[PDB]
Symmetry: C2
Subunit: 76 residues, 2 copies
């Protein structure tokens, strides 16, 4: 049984709905805890402003991917 229900469930409330420059997006940490009322993207901007963004958007599909492939260093 889930012996840990008193957990700080990192979630969101709103979602940056403005095409945030992929540049601003210093990183991304897709939230999705089983206790969060909603899934989201933690677009860690450059100033560390973690921005929950609707992953079902068309601008977060391009940015979230740019970060999904930003730390990928192909072994040369």
């Amino acid at each position: 049984q889930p012996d840990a229900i008193n957990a700080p469930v990192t979630c969101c409330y709103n979602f940056t709905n403005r095409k945030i420059s992929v540049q601003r997006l210093a990183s991304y940490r897709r939230i999705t805890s089983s206790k969060c009322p909603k899934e989201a993207v933690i677009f860690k901007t450059i100033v560390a402003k973690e921005i929950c963004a609707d992953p079902k958007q068309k601008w977060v599909q391009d940015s979230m991917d740019h970060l999904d492939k930003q730390t990928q260093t192909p072994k040369t």
Copy 2:
């Protein structure tokens, strides 16, 4: 004006109401974001099970203090 409302607001939902051994409490990160419906203590147990605990309890007043004074190294 708050230009960051699409934020992942680290919050909780329940609170460990059993006197958790201060030993188990590897650390503590008192939550209290202006967007969290409730304040809490992130009692990072030893297994890293962040446990939100009611700071208004009498067992979290002793433990939360033990962690509030666990990383304090008086310069000798």
